[PDB]
Amino acid sequence: MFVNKQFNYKDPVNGVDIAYIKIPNAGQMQPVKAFKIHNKIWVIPERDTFTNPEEGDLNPPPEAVSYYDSTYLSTDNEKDNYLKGVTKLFERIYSTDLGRMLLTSIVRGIPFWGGSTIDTELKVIDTNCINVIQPDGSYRSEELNLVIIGPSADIIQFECKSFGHDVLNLTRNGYGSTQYIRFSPDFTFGFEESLEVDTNPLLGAGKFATDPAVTLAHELIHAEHRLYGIAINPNRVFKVNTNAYYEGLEVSFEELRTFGGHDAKFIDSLQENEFRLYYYNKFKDVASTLNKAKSIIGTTASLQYMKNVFKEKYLLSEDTSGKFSVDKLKFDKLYKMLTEIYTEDNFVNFFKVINAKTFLNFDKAVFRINIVPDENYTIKDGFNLKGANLSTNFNGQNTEINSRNFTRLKN
């Protein structure tokens, strides 16, 4: 039961799990109503016009496969439906063993307290918090790990982003930082079945639709990487050979790793070792920082308590003197779990749903959906409902057969 509370958009703010909040480095935004669906995880049912200065408008630019609709997610009812859709996908992910593990890792992934210039001092990094406005009018500073928010101008441009320090590279120095995922449970993508000799022949008809749960899990995987500060520099790319009429299409290692499967293998053995040793070295530095820490600022919690929070996050070893160190095999398990076990491909397998076999299998269309009604989608079966006749040959995902759950929009 990942979300132990039925949240309706119109429920009165209480200053605890329903409240108007302000986001860091968002300049001077108006407070937005948010919901805390799980410890360290909030959801803002608004179009994202706060995380980025240059993207504070929902206006359709000169363009470039995208989808725009400045009116999407503008009504309370829509926001209410958005909230229920996100909450439902989390329950779907969490219902699996893989998902239960991923979300647990995310919740234990508190961004490191490395905001002090004094090495004998542990301090929080302000951009890893939000201000929770209370019913009285005061604001309470709250640390959080994950924020799910609506998309910006391009509705289908989902992504996992964060604020990041002035000097430090939080998503790549092992510290981690609060992750903001632009996502929408109201849309999904259509892909075409790459007819391979051993693939099921009884496949209903043309287009199939991506299960929004796989899509959210995809972003959650980026979040895990970023929260543990072991994300692969987005500069790193593989020059994919597509056509002969193409002298090259770049695809980042971070994406190939996240998708997993055959795709992940484009990251050769030399690069894998490089990233692993690098991050191993980074964890060892976090251990040293914790070891030199004698005081904590922004006081409330005890020093030992916070040190312990990071001993748990990084799976550090503590001797009888109380000094932390990094254990090679524990690091290996943690790192492998985050980069090789949590992948889009492994989720497609747990969920038992049809999905593109690789990015190379680019989505043909964009569909409008609504997973909230149980008559349409369930936590356990997604679109391929049991009693129904949709639970056969993935009929539930067939946009021809399950034409009533999909409404074509673009491409």
Ligand SMILES: N=C(N)NCCC[C@H](N)C(=O)NO
């Ligand atoms: N299935 C999709 N078409 N996903 C939409 C987001 C694609 C984006 N590049 C991304 O992967 N972000 O993480």
Ligand SMILES: [Zn+2]
């Ligand atoms: Zn991605």
